[PDB]
Coordinates of C-alpha atoms in Angstrom, one line a residue:
Chain A
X1 CA -50.6 12.0 -89.4
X2 CA -46.7 12.2 -89.3
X3 CA -43.9 12.0 -91.8
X4 CA -42.6 9.3 -89.6
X5 CA -45.5 7.0 -90.6
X6 CA -46.0 8.6 -94.2
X7 CA -42.4 7.5 -95.0
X8 CA -44.0 4.0 -95.1
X9 CA -47.6 5.0 -95.7
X10 CA -46.8 6.4 -99.1
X11 CA -44.7 3.3 -100.0
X12 CA -47.8 1.3 -99.0
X13 CA -50.0 3.2 -101.7
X14 CA -47.1 3.0 -104.1
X15 CA -46.5 -0.9 -103.4
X16 CA -50.4 -1.2 -104.0
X17 CA -49.7 1.0 -107.2
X18 CA -52.8 3.3 -106.1
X19 CA -50.7 6.2 -106.8
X20 CA -53.6 8.8 -106.7
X21 CA -53.8 7.8 -102.9
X22 CA -50.1 8.0 -102.6
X23 CA -50.3 11.6 -104.0
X24 CA -52.6 12.9 -101.3
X25 CA -50.5 11.0 -98.7
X26 CA -47.3 12.9 -100.0
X27 CA -49.0 16.2 -100.1
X28 CA -49.9 15.8 -96.4
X29 CA -46.2 15.0 -95.7
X30 CA -45.0 18.0 -97.8
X31 CA -47.2 20.7 -96.1
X32 CA -46.4 19.2 -92.7
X33 CA -42.6 18.8 -93.0
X34 CA -41.5 21.3 -95.5
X35 CA -38.5 19.0 -96.6
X36 CA -37.8 15.6 -98.1
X37 CA -34.2 14.3 -98.1
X38 CA -32.6 12.4 -100.9
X39 CA -34.7 9.1 -100.5
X40 CA -38.1 10.3 -99.3
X41 CA -38.2 12.9 -101.9
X42 CA -38.4 10.0 -104.5
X43 CA -41.8 9.3 -103.1
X44 CA -43.2 12.8 -103.9
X45 CA -41.6 12.7 -107.1
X46 CA -42.8 9.2 -108.2
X47 CA -46.3 9.8 -106.9
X48 CA -47.0 12.7 -109.1
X49 CA -45.0 11.4 -112.1
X50 CA -47.1 8.2 -112.3
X51 CA -50.5 10.3 -111.8
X52 CA -49.5 12.5 -114.7
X53 CA -48.0 9.6 -116.9
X54 CA -51.3 7.6 -117.2
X55 CA -53.2 10.6 -118.0
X56 CA -50.5 11.6 -120.7
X57 CA -50.7 8.0 -122.3
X58 CA -54.6 8.2 -122.3
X59 CA -54.6 11.7 -123.8
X60 CA -52.0 10.8 -126.3
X61 CA -54.1 7.8 -127.5
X62 CA -57.6 9.6 -127.3
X63 CA -56.3 12.6 -129.3
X64 CA -54.6 10.4 -131.8
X65 CA -58.0 8.4 -132.2
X66 CA -59.8 11.9 -132.7
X67 CA -57.4 12.8 -135.6
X68 CA -57.6 9.3 -137.1
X69 CA -61.0 8.4 -137.5
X70 CA -62.9 10.8 -139.8
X71 CA -68.9 14.0 -137.1
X72 CA -70.1 11.1 -134.8
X73 CA -66.6 10.9 -133.2
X74 CA -67.3 14.3 -131.5
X75 CA -67.5 12.3 -128.3
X76 CA -63.7 11.9 -128.2
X77 CA -63.4 15.6 -127.8
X78 CA -65.5 15.3 -124.6
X79 CA -63.4 12.8 -123.1
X80 CA -60.2 14.4 -124.2
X81 CA -61.5 17.6 -122.5
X82 CA -62.1 15.6 -119.1
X83 CA -58.7 14.3 -119.5
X84 CA -57.0 17.7 -120.1
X85 CA -58.9 19.3 -117.4
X86 CA -58.0 16.5 -115.0
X87 CA -54.3 16.9 -115.9
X88 CA -54.5 20.7 -115.7
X89 CA -56.1 20.5 -112.3
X90 CA -53.3 17.9 -111.1
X91 CA -50.6 20.1 -112.6
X92 CA -52.1 23.2 -110.6
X93 CA -52.2 21.2 -107.6
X94 CA -48.6 20.4 -108.0
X95 CA -47.6 24.0 -109.0
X96 CA -49.3 25.4 -106.1
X97 CA -47.7 22.9 -103.7
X98 CA -44.3 23.3 -105.4
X99 CA -44.2 26.9 -105.3
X100 CA -45.7 27.3 -101.8
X101 CA -43.5 25.0 -99.9
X102 CA -40.9 23.7 -102.4
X103 CA -39.5 27.2 -103.6
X104 CA -39.2 29.0 -100.3
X105 CA -37.9 26.1 -98.0
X106 CA -34.8 25.4 -100.3
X107 CA -31.6 25.1 -98.2
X108 CA -29.2 23.1 -100.3
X109 CA -28.0 23.1 -104.1
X110 CA -29.8 19.7 -104.3
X111 CA -33.1 21.1 -103.2
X112 CA -33.0 24.1 -105.3
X113 CA -31.9 22.3 -108.5
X114 CA -34.3 19.5 -107.9
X115 CA -37.5 21.7 -107.3
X116 CA -36.8 24.2 -110.1
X117 CA -36.2 21.1 -112.6
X118 CA -39.5 19.7 -111.2
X119 CA -41.3 23.0 -112.0
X120 CA -40.1 22.9 -115.7
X121 CA -41.4 19.4 -116.4
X122 CA -44.7 20.0 -114.8
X123 CA -45.0 22.9 -117.1
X124 CA -43.7 20.7 -120.0
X125 CA -46.7 18.4 -119.4
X126 CA -48.9 21.3 -119.5
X127 CA -47.4 22.2 -122.9
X128 CA -48.4 18.9 -124.3
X129 CA -52.1 19.8 -123.6
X130 CA -51.6 23.5 -124.7
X131 CA -52.8 25.2 -127.8
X132 CA -50.5 28.3 -128.9
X133 CA -52.2 31.0 -126.7
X134 CA -51.7 28.9 -123.4
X135 CA -48.5 27.3 -124.9
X136 CA -46.5 30.6 -125.1
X137 CA -47.0 31.4 -121.5
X138 CA -46.5 27.7 -120.5
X139 CA -43.2 27.4 -122.3
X140 CA -41.8 30.8 -121.0
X141 CA -42.5 29.5 -117.6
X142 CA -40.8 26.2 -118.3
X143 CA -37.8 27.8 -119.9
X144 CA -37.4 30.2 -117.0
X145 CA -37.6 27.3 -114.8
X146 CA -35.0 24.9 -116.7
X147 CA -32.6 28.0 -117.0
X148 CA -32.8 28.9 -113.1
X149 CA -32.2 25.2 -112.4
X150 CA -29.5 24.9 -115.1
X151 CA -27.5 27.9 -113.7
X152 CA -27.2 26.5 -110.1
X153 CA -26.6 22.9 -111.2
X154 CA -23.9 24.1 -113.6
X155 CA -21.9 25.6 -110.7
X156 CA -23.0 23.4 -107.7
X157 CA -23.5 19.8 -108.8
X158 CA -20.6 18.4 -110.6
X159 CA -21.6 15.8 -113.2
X160 CA -20.1 13.2 -111.0
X161 CA -23.7 13.4 -109.4
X162 CA -27.0 12.5 -110.9
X163 CA -29.5 15.2 -110.6
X164 CA -27.8 17.6 -113.2
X165 CA -27.9 14.8 -115.6
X166 CA -31.7 14.2 -115.7
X167 CA -32.0 18.1 -115.5
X168 CA -29.8 18.2 -118.6
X169 CA -31.8 15.4 -120.5
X170 CA -35.3 16.8 -119.8
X171 CA -33.9 20.3 -120.6
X172 CA -32.9 18.9 -124.0
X173 CA -36.3 17.4 -124.5
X174 CA -38.2 20.6 -123.8
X175 CA -36.4 22.1 -126.9
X176 CA -36.6 19.0 -129.0
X177 CA -40.3 18.2 -128.6
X178 CA -41.8 21.8 -128.0
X179 CA -39.5 24.0 -129.8
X180 CA -37.6 21.6 -132.1
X181 CA -34.0 22.8 -132.4
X182 CA -31.7 19.8 -132.9
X183 CA -28.6 22.2 -132.5
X184 CA -29.9 23.2 -129.0
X185 CA -30.6 19.5 -128.3
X186 CA -27.1 18.4 -129.0
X187 CA -25.7 21.5 -127.5
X188 CA -27.2 20.7 -124.1
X189 CA -27.2 16.8 -124.4
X190 CA -23.7 16.4 -126.0
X191 CA -21.9 18.9 -123.8
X192 CA -23.4 17.5 -120.6
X193 CA -22.6 13.9 -121.7
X194 CA -19.0 15.0 -122.7
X195 CA -18.6 16.6 -119.1
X196 CA -20.1 13.5 -117.5
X197 CA -17.5 11.3 -119.6
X198 CA -14.8 13.7 -118.1
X199 CA -16.4 13.1 -114.7
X200 CA -16.7 9.2 -115.4
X201 CA -13.8 8.1 -113.2
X202 CA -15.4 9.8 -110.3
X203 CA -19.1 8.9 -110.1
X204 CA -20.4 8.2 -106.7
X205 CA -21.7 4.7 -105.7
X206 CA -25.2 5.3 -106.7
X207 CA -24.1 7.4 -109.7
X208 CA -22.3 4.3 -111.0
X209 CA -25.8 2.9 -111.6
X210 CA -27.9 5.9 -112.0
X211 CA -25.6 8.3 -113.9
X212 CA -24.7 5.6 -116.3
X213 CA -28.2 4.8 -116.9
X214 CA -28.9 8.6 -117.6
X215 CA -26.0 8.8 -119.9
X216 CA -27.4 5.7 -121.7
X217 CA -30.7 7.7 -122.2
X218 CA -28.5 10.6 -123.5
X219 CA -27.0 8.4 -126.2
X220 CA -30.4 7.1 -126.9
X221 CA -32.0 10.5 -127.4
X222 CA -28.8 11.9 -129.1
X223 CA -29.3 9.0 -131.6
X224 CA -33.0 9.9 -132.3
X225 CA -32.1 13.5 -132.3
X226 CA -29.1 13.3 -134.8
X227 CA -31.6 11.5 -137.1
Chain B
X1 CA -41.4 8.0 -130.5
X2 CA -40.7 10.4 -127.3
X3 CA -38.4 9.9 -124.1
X4 CA -37.9 11.6 -120.8
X5 CA -10.2 -14.0 -139.4
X6 CA -10.3 -10.7 -137.5
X7 CA -9.1 -10.9 -133.9
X8 CA -10.4 -8.3 -131.8
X9 CA -10.8 -8.1 -128.0
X10 CA -9.2 -10.5 -125.6
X11 CA -12.1 -12.0 -123.4
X12 CA -10.2 -14.4 -121.3
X13 CA -6.6 -17.3 -125.1
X14 CA -10.1 -16.4 -126.0
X15 CA -10.8 -13.3 -128.2
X16 CA -13.9 -11.7 -129.8
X17 CA -13.5 -12.1 -133.6
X18 CA -15.0 -11.5 -136.9
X19 CA -15.5 -14.4 -139.4
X20 CA -18.9 -14.1 -141.3
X21 CA -20.0 -12.2 -138.2
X22 CA -19.0 -12.4 -134.6
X23 CA -17.2 -15.6 -133.5
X24 CA -15.3 -16.6 -130.4
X25 CA -11.7 -17.5 -131.2
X26 CA -9.6 -19.6 -128.9
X27 CA -5.9 -19.0 -130.1
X28 CA 2.1 -31.6 -127.1
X29 CA 0.3 -28.5 -128.1
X30 CA -0.4 -29.6 -131.7
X31 CA -2.0 -32.8 -130.4
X32 CA -4.2 -31.0 -127.9
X33 CA -5.3 -28.9 -130.7
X34 CA -5.6 -31.9 -133.2
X35 CA -7.9 -33.7 -130.5
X36 CA -10.0 -30.7 -129.8
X37 CA -10.7 -30.0 -133.4
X38 CA -11.0 -33.8 -134.0
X39 CA -13.9 -33.9 -131.4
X40 CA -15.6 -30.7 -132.3
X41 CA -16.1 -32.0 -136.0
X42 CA -18.1 -34.8 -134.3
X43 CA -20.6 -32.3 -132.7
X44 CA -23.6 -30.7 -134.2
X45 CA -26.5 -29.8 -131.7
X46 CA -28.1 -26.5 -130.4
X47 CA -26.5 -27.1 -126.8
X48 CA -23.2 -27.5 -128.0
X49 CA -21.1 -24.4 -129.0
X50 CA -21.0 -24.4 -132.8
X51 CA -17.6 -25.3 -134.0
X52 CA -17.1 -23.1 -137.3
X53 CA -13.4 -24.1 -138.1
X54 CA -9.8 -24.0 -137.3
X55 CA -6.5 -22.1 -138.2
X56 CA -3.0 -23.3 -138.3
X57 CA -1.3 -20.0 -139.4
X58 CA -0.4 -17.3 -138.1
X59 CA -1.2 -19.3 -134.9
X60 CA -3.4 -22.3 -134.0
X61 CA -6.9 -21.4 -133.5
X62 CA -10.4 -22.7 -132.9
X63 CA -13.3 -20.7 -134.2
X64 CA -16.9 -21.0 -132.8
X65 CA -20.3 -19.2 -132.9
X66 CA -20.2 -15.9 -130.5
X67 CA -22.5 -16.2 -127.7
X68 CA -23.7 -12.8 -126.3
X69 CA -24.6 -13.1 -122.5
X70 CA -22.2 -14.7 -120.3
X71 CA -21.0 -18.0 -118.6
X72 CA -23.5 -19.6 -116.1
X73 CA -20.5 -18.9 -113.6
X74 CA -20.8 -15.4 -114.6
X75 CA -24.5 -15.2 -114.0
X76 CA -24.8 -17.0 -110.7
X77 CA -21.5 -16.0 -108.9
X78 CA -38.5 -22.8 -114.4
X79 CA -35.7 -21.1 -116.3
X80 CA -33.1 -22.9 -113.9
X81 CA -34.6 -26.4 -114.8
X82 CA -34.7 -25.4 -118.3
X83 CA -30.9 -24.6 -118.2
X84 CA -30.5 -28.1 -116.5
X85 CA -32.5 -29.8 -119.1
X86 CA -30.6 -28.3 -122.1
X87 CA -27.3 -29.0 -120.1
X88 CA -28.4 -32.5 -119.8
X89 CA -29.7 -32.6 -123.6
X90 CA -26.0 -31.7 -124.7
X91 CA -24.2 -34.0 -122.5
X92 CA -26.4 -37.0 -123.7
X93 CA -25.6 -36.0 -127.2
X94 CA -21.9 -36.1 -126.3
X95 CA -21.9 -39.5 -124.6
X96 CA -24.1 -41.1 -127.3
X97 CA -21.3 -40.1 -129.6
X98 CA -18.8 -41.7 -127.1
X99 CA -17.4 -38.2 -126.0
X100 CA -16.4 -37.5 -122.5
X101 CA -16.3 -33.8 -121.8
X102 CA -13.9 -34.1 -118.7
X103 CA -14.3 -30.4 -117.6
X104 CA -18.0 -29.5 -117.3
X105 CA -18.5 -26.5 -115.1
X106 CA -20.6 -23.5 -115.0
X107 CA -17.6 -21.5 -116.7
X108 CA -18.1 -23.7 -119.9
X109 CA -21.7 -23.4 -120.2
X110 CA -22.6 -20.3 -122.1
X111 CA -26.0 -18.8 -121.8
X112 CA -26.7 -17.5 -125.4
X113 CA -29.2 -14.5 -125.5
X114 CA -30.1 -15.7 -122.0
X115 CA -32.2 -18.5 -123.3
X116 CA -30.0 -21.2 -124.9
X117 CA -27.4 -23.4 -123.4
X118 CA -24.0 -24.0 -125.1
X119 CA -21.4 -26.5 -123.8
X120 CA -11.3 -27.6 -111.9
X121 CA -11.7 -28.8 -108.4
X122 CA -15.3 -28.1 -107.4
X123 CA -16.8 -30.3 -110.3
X124 CA -14.4 -33.2 -110.2
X125 CA -15.8 -36.5 -108.8
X126 CA -12.9 -40.4 -116.2
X127 CA -16.1 -41.9 -117.5
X128 CA -19.6 -40.9 -118.3
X129 CA -20.4 -40.7 -114.5
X130 CA -17.7 -38.3 -113.7
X131 CA -19.4 -35.6 -116.0
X132 CA -22.6 -36.8 -114.3
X133 CA -21.0 -35.7 -111.1
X134 CA -19.9 -32.3 -112.6
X135 CA -23.4 -31.7 -114.0
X136 CA -24.8 -32.5 -110.4
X137 CA -22.5 -29.6 -109.1
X138 CA -24.0 -27.5 -111.7
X139 CA -27.6 -28.4 -110.5
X140 CA -26.3 -27.3 -107.0
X141 CA -25.1 -23.9 -108.5
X142 CA -28.3 -23.6 -110.2
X143 CA -30.5 -24.5 -107.2
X144 CA -28.5 -22.7 -104.4
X145 CA -27.2 -19.9 -106.5
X146 CA -23.9 -20.8 -104.8
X147 CA -36.6 -26.4 -105.7
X148 CA -38.8 -29.4 -106.4
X149 CA -38.1 -32.4 -104.1
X150 CA -37.5 -34.4 -107.3
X151 CA -34.7 -32.2 -108.2
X152 CA -32.8 -32.5 -104.9
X153 CA -33.3 -36.3 -105.3
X154 CA -31.7 -36.0 -108.8
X155 CA -29.0 -33.9 -107.6
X156 CA -28.1 -36.5 -105.0
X157 CA -28.1 -39.2 -107.6
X158 CA -25.8 -37.5 -109.9
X159 CA -23.6 -36.6 -106.8
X160 CA -24.9 -42.4 -110.5
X161 CA -27.6 -42.1 -113.3
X162 CA -26.7 -41.6 -116.9
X163 CA -28.2 -38.6 -118.9
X164 CA -31.1 -40.4 -120.8
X165 CA -32.4 -41.1 -117.1
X166 CA -31.5 -37.6 -116.0
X167 CA -33.3 -36.1 -118.9
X168 CA -36.3 -38.2 -118.5
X169 CA -36.4 -37.2 -115.0
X170 CA -36.0 -33.4 -115.5
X171 CA -38.7 -33.4 -118.4
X172 CA -41.1 -35.3 -116.0
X173 CA -40.3 -32.9 -113.4
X174 CA -58.0 -16.9 -113.0
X175 CA -59.9 -15.8 -116.2
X176 CA -58.8 -14.0 -119.3
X177 CA -61.2 -11.4 -120.8
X178 CA -61.7 -10.2 -124.5
Chain C
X1 CA -78.0 7.8 -126.6
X2 CA -77.3 4.1 -125.7
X3 CA -75.1 3.1 -128.6
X4 CA -73.0 6.2 -128.1
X5 CA -72.5 4.9 -124.5
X6 CA -71.2 1.8 -126.1
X7 CA -68.8 4.2 -128.0
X8 CA -67.8 5.9 -124.8
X9 CA -67.0 2.7 -123.1
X10 CA -64.7 1.6 -126.3
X11 CA -63.2 5.1 -126.0
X12 CA -62.6 4.6 -122.2
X13 CA -61.1 1.0 -122.8
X14 CA -58.8 2.3 -125.5
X15 CA -58.0 5.1 -123.0
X16 CA -57.0 2.6 -120.4
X17 CA -59.6 4.5 -118.0
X18 CA -61.5 1.5 -116.4
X19 CA -63.2 3.5 -113.6
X20 CA -65.1 5.8 -115.9
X21 CA -65.8 2.5 -118.0
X22 CA -67.6 1.3 -115.0
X23 CA -69.8 4.4 -114.8
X24 CA -70.6 4.0 -118.4
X25 CA -71.4 0.3 -118.2
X26 CA -73.7 0.8 -115.2
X27 CA -75.6 3.8 -117.0
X28 CA -76.0 1.3 -119.8
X29 CA -77.3 -1.3 -117.5
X30 CA -80.1 1.0 -116.3
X31 CA -82.0 0.3 -119.6
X32 CA -82.6 -3.3 -118.5
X33 CA -82.0 -4.9 -121.9
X34 CA -80.2 -8.1 -122.7
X35 CA -76.8 -7.0 -123.6
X36 CA -75.7 -8.3 -127.0
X37 CA -72.3 -10.2 -127.0
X38 CA -70.0 -7.2 -127.5
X39 CA -72.1 -5.1 -125.2
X40 CA -72.0 -7.7 -122.6
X41 CA -68.2 -8.2 -122.9
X42 CA -67.8 -4.3 -122.3
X43 CA -70.1 -4.7 -119.3
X44 CA -67.9 -7.4 -118.0
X45 CA -64.3 -5.8 -118.7
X46 CA -65.1 -2.6 -117.0
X47 CA -65.9 -4.1 -113.6
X48 CA -63.5 -6.9 -114.0
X49 CA -60.4 -4.7 -114.4
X50 CA -61.8 -2.1 -111.9
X51 CA -61.8 -4.8 -108.9
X52 CA -58.4 -6.2 -109.9
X53 CA -56.6 -3.2 -109.0
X54 CA -58.1 -3.2 -105.6
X55 CA -57.5 -6.9 -105.2
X56 CA -53.9 -6.6 -105.7
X57 CA -53.6 -3.7 -103.4
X58 CA -55.5 -5.7 -100.7
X59 CA -53.0 -8.8 -101.3
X60 CA -49.8 -6.4 -100.7
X61 CA -51.2 -4.7 -97.7
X62 CA -52.6 -7.9 -96.1
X63 CA -49.0 -9.6 -96.8
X64 CA -47.6 -6.5 -95.2
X65 CA -49.8 -6.8 -92.0
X66 CA -48.5 -10.4 -91.6
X67 CA -45.0 -9.4 -92.3
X68 CA -45.1 -6.3 -90.0
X69 CA -43.0 -6.4 -86.7
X70 CA -42.9 -4.1 -83.7
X71 CA -45.0 -1.1 -82.4
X72 CA -48.6 -1.1 -83.1
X73 CA -49.0 2.2 -85.1
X74 CA -47.1 0.7 -88.2
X75 CA -49.5 -2.2 -88.3
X76 CA -52.4 0.3 -87.6
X77 CA -51.3 2.1 -90.8
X78 CA -51.9 -1.3 -92.7
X79 CA -55.3 -1.7 -90.7
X80 CA -56.5 1.6 -91.5
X81 CA -55.5 0.8 -95.2
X82 CA -57.3 -2.4 -95.0
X83 CA -60.5 -0.9 -93.6
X84 CA -60.2 1.9 -96.4
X85 CA -59.5 -0.6 -99.1
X86 CA -61.9 -3.3 -98.1
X87 CA -64.8 -0.9 -97.7
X88 CA -63.8 0.7 -101.1
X89 CA -64.0 -2.8 -102.5
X90 CA -67.2 -3.5 -100.8
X91 CA -69.0 -0.6 -102.0
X92 CA -67.7 -1.4 -105.6
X93 CA -68.9 -5.0 -105.3
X94 CA -72.3 -4.1 -103.8
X95 CA -72.5 -1.5 -106.7
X96 CA -72.0 -4.0 -109.4
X97 CA -74.1 -6.7 -107.4
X98 CA -77.2 -4.4 -107.1
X99 CA -77.1 -3.7 -110.8
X100 CA -76.6 -7.2 -111.7
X101 CA -79.2 -8.4 -109.5
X102 CA -81.9 -5.8 -110.3
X103 CA -81.1 -5.3 -114.1
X104 CA -79.4 -8.5 -115.3
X105 CA -81.1 -11.3 -113.4
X106 CA -84.8 -10.4 -113.9
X107 CA -84.6 -10.1 -117.7
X108 CA -82.0 -12.7 -118.3
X109 CA -80.8 -17.5 -122.2
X110 CA -77.0 -18.0 -121.8
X111 CA -77.3 -14.6 -120.4
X112 CA -78.7 -16.3 -117.1
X113 CA -75.6 -18.2 -116.4
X114 CA -73.3 -15.3 -117.4
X115 CA -74.8 -13.0 -115.0
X116 CA -74.9 -15.7 -112.2
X117 CA -71.3 -16.4 -112.9
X118 CA -70.6 -12.6 -112.4
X119 CA -72.3 -12.7 -109.3
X120 CA -70.3 -15.3 -107.8
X121 CA -67.0 -13.8 -109.0
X122 CA -67.7 -10.6 -107.1
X123 CA -68.7 -12.6 -104.0
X124 CA -65.4 -14.6 -104.2
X125 CA -63.7 -11.3 -104.1
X126 CA -65.8 -10.5 -101.1
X127 CA -64.9 -13.7 -99.5
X128 CA -61.2 -12.9 -99.9
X129 CA -61.6 -9.7 -97.8
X130 CA -64.1 -11.1 -95.4
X131 CA -63.3 -11.9 -91.8
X132 CA -65.6 -13.4 -88.9
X133 CA -68.4 -15.6 -89.8
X134 CA -70.3 -13.6 -92.4
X135 CA -67.7 -14.8 -94.7
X136 CA -69.7 -18.2 -94.7
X137 CA -73.0 -16.6 -95.6
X138 CA -71.5 -14.8 -98.6
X139 CA -69.7 -18.0 -99.9
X140 CA -73.0 -19.9 -99.4
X141 CA -75.3 -17.6 -101.5
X142 CA -72.5 -17.2 -104.0
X143 CA -72.4 -21.2 -104.4
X144 CA -76.2 -21.1 -104.7
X145 CA -76.0 -18.9 -107.8
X146 CA -73.2 -21.1 -109.1
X147 CA -75.6 -24.1 -108.6
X148 CA -78.4 -22.1 -110.4
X149 CA -75.8 -21.5 -113.3
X150 CA -74.6 -25.1 -113.4
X151 CA -78.2 -26.4 -113.7
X152 CA -78.3 -24.7 -117.0
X153 CA -74.7 -26.1 -118.0
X154 CA -75.9 -28.4 -120.6
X155 CA -79.5 -27.2 -121.4
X156 CA -79.0 -24.5 -123.8
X157 CA -75.2 -24.8 -125.4
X158 CA -72.4 -27.1 -126.2
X159 CA -70.0 -28.7 -123.5
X160 CA -67.4 -26.3 -124.9
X161 CA -69.3 -23.2 -125.4
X162 CA -67.3 -20.3 -124.2
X163 CA -69.5 -19.2 -121.2
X164 CA -69.5 -22.9 -120.1
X165 CA -65.9 -22.9 -119.9
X166 CA -65.4 -19.9 -117.5
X167 CA -68.5 -21.1 -115.5
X168 CA -66.9 -24.4 -114.8
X169 CA -63.3 -23.0 -114.1
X170 CA -64.3 -20.4 -111.5
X171 CA -66.9 -22.9 -109.7
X172 CA -63.7 -25.1 -109.0
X173 CA -62.0 -22.3 -107.2
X174 CA -64.9 -21.8 -104.9
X175 CA -64.0 -25.5 -103.5
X176 CA -60.2 -25.1 -103.5
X177 CA -59.5 -21.7 -102.2
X178 CA -61.5 -20.9 -98.8
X179 CA -63.9 -23.7 -98.7
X180 CA -60.5 -25.2 -98.4
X181 CA -61.2 -28.6 -100.0
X182 CA -58.6 -29.0 -102.8
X183 CA -59.4 -32.9 -103.6
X184 CA -63.0 -31.9 -103.9
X185 CA -62.0 -29.1 -106.1
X186 CA -59.6 -31.3 -108.3
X187 CA -62.6 -33.5 -108.9
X188 CA -64.4 -30.7 -110.6
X189 CA -61.3 -29.2 -112.2
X190 CA -60.3 -32.6 -114.0
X191 CA -63.8 -33.5 -114.9
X192 CA -64.4 -30.1 -116.5
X193 CA -60.9 -30.1 -118.0
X194 CA -61.1 -33.7 -119.5
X195 CA -64.6 -33.1 -120.8
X196 CA -63.3 -30.3 -123.0
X197 CA -60.0 -32.1 -123.7
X198 CA -62.0 -35.1 -124.9
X199 CA -64.4 -32.9 -126.9
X200 CA -61.4 -31.4 -128.6
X201 CA -63.8 -29.2 -130.5
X202 CA -65.9 -25.9 -130.2
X203 CA -68.5 -23.6 -132.2
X204 CA -66.3 -21.1 -133.8
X205 CA -62.8 -20.0 -134.8
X206 CA -62.8 -17.5 -132.0
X207 CA -64.1 -20.1 -129.4
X208 CA -61.2 -22.5 -130.4
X209 CA -58.5 -20.0 -129.7
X210 CA -60.2 -19.0 -126.4
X211 CA -61.0 -22.6 -125.2
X212 CA -57.2 -23.4 -126.1
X213 CA -56.2 -20.9 -123.4
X214 CA -58.4 -21.9 -120.5
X215 CA -57.6 -25.5 -120.4
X216 CA -53.7 -24.5 -119.5
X217 CA -55.1 -22.6 -116.5
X218 CA -57.1 -25.7 -115.4
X219 CA -53.9 -27.8 -115.9
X220 CA -51.7 -25.2 -113.9
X221 CA -54.3 -25.3 -111.2
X222 CA -54.5 -29.2 -110.9
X223 CA -50.7 -29.6 -111.1
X224 CA -50.5 -26.9 -108.2
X225 CA -53.3 -28.6 -106.5
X226 CA -52.4 -31.4 -104.0
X227 CA -48.6 -30.7 -104.6

């Protein structure tokens, strides 16, 4: 059990697309090493992102059917409750890992920004599950997280570099889905895109691909949100 | 859902244009123009870039359908064989109408919507066989990016068969659950 | 109860949640009834999709074992995965096979051939992962079940009855793939294919569309085979 092997061993579970196995694999890396540099951190990110992604699609569909159908269909609630409790438990796992290793370790602007953004989005997924009583706490925690992330990123990462951009777009989603305020959505999204357009001469080599993709996603969301 | 004629731009003279939609515009000389138009009027086929008309003023111009995507040259430098079949499909049409292209190369083959084919030293062997040679250089670009054994053979014949034979050649070349 | 398990399976399928669908169809299977045609499709789908995920996982990691170069421990990651994956797959295969043998086979009449077909499908996947000589004993008892199935092939239903189509297709793969006899396999593939292509007809609107898919698969195998 070493990060030296697990750099590959997680890529194995990912290349097999058995992301649940990848998640246990990356958890062992994280508690062992207390760091992931800018490629190997993707492993942690993508593993947990896909594990919640499937659950969220299932939950979305199941809950849609529950509302669509008609008393007999009460079985749908049983299974939704199973999915929601899985996704809760998965997010509690992520929260406990992210707080305990991922908050205190942080020793670059990239690390501080990245994990603080991460925290907000994992709360945002809980917000999809949450009824109003839970939801208030969940959204407050997420808003704290995106704000703390934003403040650092706003000074430290010039919009020439990508992480700030994904932070801005997801921070914009967090208002638009959960707390719909199209002015707030355009305020974050359009200002960040205008900054990134001002940075557009001076994207890094990876940023020529990635930041332009993220800027395209900003135009896409802006189109939907001005509608 | 959720998430987390109007002449415009110079393309390469080739311009992007507006005439009942998007159109490509290419804008001794009179003769070269007269001949091109004259030849274009005689073409009507999916694999020949669709001639739409011409202009004599304010300048001389040829208008064609706009192809979104790019040239084969641009892309490269089962789908491949299909590009080859289509490219042969249009060259056949051309020859049957006693037309020799004389300038077949991956730059003049336009890959419309990345699906449909629409028709310099490296491609030069004029006759029907000279275009066949050029086309074989295209197969070389297709297959080297720079492959059935029958396709290497066909390459080496064209590098000579005529297009019917080439076409005939290319054309000849677990459980789902409810 | 048992119709509500049919609903639970349909819900789980619409949820894209195949592993829980397998637990539902297993618990349905305990009754020992002849499953009706939908009820039978559900039993098939749940295990069919569950295994496919582990098969493609196994394919990638086995390919990686061959591709791997240098010091042992990296190849040992792949070994540990193969043992882990192959045992995971083995237990899944034996879990379905035990249910199939006990419940399905004793009370099975096209049901008989359907269940025998399933038996050899799961054995084929075992044969893929098998190493050493027990590989032979698995393919042999699998081929025995396919002989028992093919002995019914023109007793009960038409030369193009849907289960007959699948029954013929998969048996041709036994000969081609690891019994490694592609010319023998072609003879079964083209005799089954041309019998159905000559018949050019089938029982129901559903079966015409379904049959039209399957013959293409047989053509693609025959044209691949002996290239």
